[PDB]
Amino acid sequence: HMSICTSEEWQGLMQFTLPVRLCKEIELFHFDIGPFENMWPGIFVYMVHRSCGTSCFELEKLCRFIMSVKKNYRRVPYHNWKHAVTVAHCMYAILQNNHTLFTDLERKGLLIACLCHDLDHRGFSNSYLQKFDHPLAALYSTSTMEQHHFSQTVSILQLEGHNIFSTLSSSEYEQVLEIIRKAIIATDLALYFGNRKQLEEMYQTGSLNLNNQSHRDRVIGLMMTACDLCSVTKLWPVTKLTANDIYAEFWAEGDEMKKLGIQPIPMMDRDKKDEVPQGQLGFYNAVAIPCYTTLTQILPPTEPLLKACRDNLSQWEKVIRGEE
Numbered sequence: 542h543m544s545i546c547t548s549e550e551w552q553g554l555m556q557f558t559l560p561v562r563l564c565k566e567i568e569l570f571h572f573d574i575g576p577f578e579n580m581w582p583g584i585f586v587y588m589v590h591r592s593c594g595t596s597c598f599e600l601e602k603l604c605r606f607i608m609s610v611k612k613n614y615r616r617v618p619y620h621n622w623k624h625a626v627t628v629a630h631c632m633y634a635i636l637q638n639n640h641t642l643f644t645d646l647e648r649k650g651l652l653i654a655c656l657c658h659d660l661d662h663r664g665f666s667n668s669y670l671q672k673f674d675h676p677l678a679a680l681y682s683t684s685t686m687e688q689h690h691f692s693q694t695v696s697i698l699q700l701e702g703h704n705i706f707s708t709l710s711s712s713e714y715e716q717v718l719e720i721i722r723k724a725i726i727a728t729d730l731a732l733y734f735g736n737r738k739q740l741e742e743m744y745q746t747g748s749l750n751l752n753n754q755s756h757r758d759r760v761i762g763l764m765m766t767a768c769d770l771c772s773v774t775k776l777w778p779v780t781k782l783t784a785n786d787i788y789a790e791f792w793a794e795g796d797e798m799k800k801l802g803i804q805p806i807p808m809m810d811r812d813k814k815d816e817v818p819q820g821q822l823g824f825y826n827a828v829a830i831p832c833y834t835t836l837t838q839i840l841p842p843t844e845p846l847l848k849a850c851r852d853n854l855s856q857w858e859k860v861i862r863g864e865e
């Protein structure tokens with residue numbers, strides 16, 4: 542049921558050298574992979590190399606894996622190859638800027654987990670899948686897509702020469718799977734509002750504890766949320782576009798619901814192009830600012846993320862108030 546990569550593709554991944562100019566820009570939180578499609582896979586490699594050592598992974602295995610993952614994203618406007626790497630890139634810049642909070646076991650687990658986080662996304666919501674009445678939602682009742690995404694990740698590693706976590710002991714092995722499992726589960730937005738509520742809480746009562754695992758787990762989940770939406774932390778011209786991608790998905794989900802006589806919720810209704818700016822402002826305030834605000838608080842070096850969200854937010858304000 543899986544999809545691998547022609548020997549051509551992966552071997553040329555090893556040949557790839559990131560051009561000297563993009564080296565300082567890549568370290569920036571607000572860096573935009575967008576202009577560099579040819580490089581996306583090779584950019585993920587370089588970050589692996591720079592994060593966790595030149596060879597935690599045997600090149601060929603990694604490259605095979607990376608390219609096989611590519612081959613398992615669909616060609617939809619938003620939850621596709623570009624987004625997985627964009628998410629990857631933000632985890633990278635997070636991990637780098639928090640150099641000693643995390644373990645090699647986490648940092649490679651997390652970079653992999655973002656790459657895989659939306660594997661084989663079809664371009665439908667959990668809602669749409671459960672609300673009527675898909676085999677994937679027939680299988681996994683809550684967090685429909687995110688479990689599929691992890692099982693997809695799972696089947697990629699279980700392949701011939703793809704198990705880049707092989708050399709690890711079986712204890713360390715099924716442990717990163719546990720990092721990656723929960724990592725991917727966390728990007729179910731539904732679950733995030735609770736997680737943030739709880740973390741909000743812990744930080745106040747001087748109670749949040751990076752030693753405790755299900756505290757670690759929560760801290761990370763928040764990092765996964767924050768990565769996932771980092772669209773909203775890129776320079777405005779990049780944030781305008783990455784939004785256009787997002788609505789072409791939603792509105793394509795709205796259409797499949799109109800085709801049935803059913804009003805889609807307005808975020809997915811193309812008959813509301815002008816309601817969007819307002820809706821975006823709402824999203825920044827109800828979901829985004831909290832996410833980055835609470836991330837900044839727990840991880841101060843990740844402040845530039847909040848700085849940039851804020852910048853976009855007021856850009857979106859300006860669009861509503863009629864100027865820009």
Ligand SMILES: Cc1ccc2c(c1)nc(CCc1nc(C)c3ncccn13)n2-c1ccccc1
Nearest residue numbers: 772773787807808813816817820821823824827
């Ligand atoms: C008329 C309308 C109405 C609401 C809308 C909307 C358009 N649009 C959005 C949010 C759209 C959006 N932008 C990025 C970057 C996203 N990421 C993940 C999920 C949604 N995202 N809401 C919204 C606002 C507030 C909360 C949740 C969703």
Ligand SMILES: [Mg+2]
Nearest residue numbers: 658659686728
């Ligand atoms: Mg997802």
Ligand SMILES: [Zn+2]
Nearest residue numbers: 658659728769
């Ligand atoms: Zn995502």
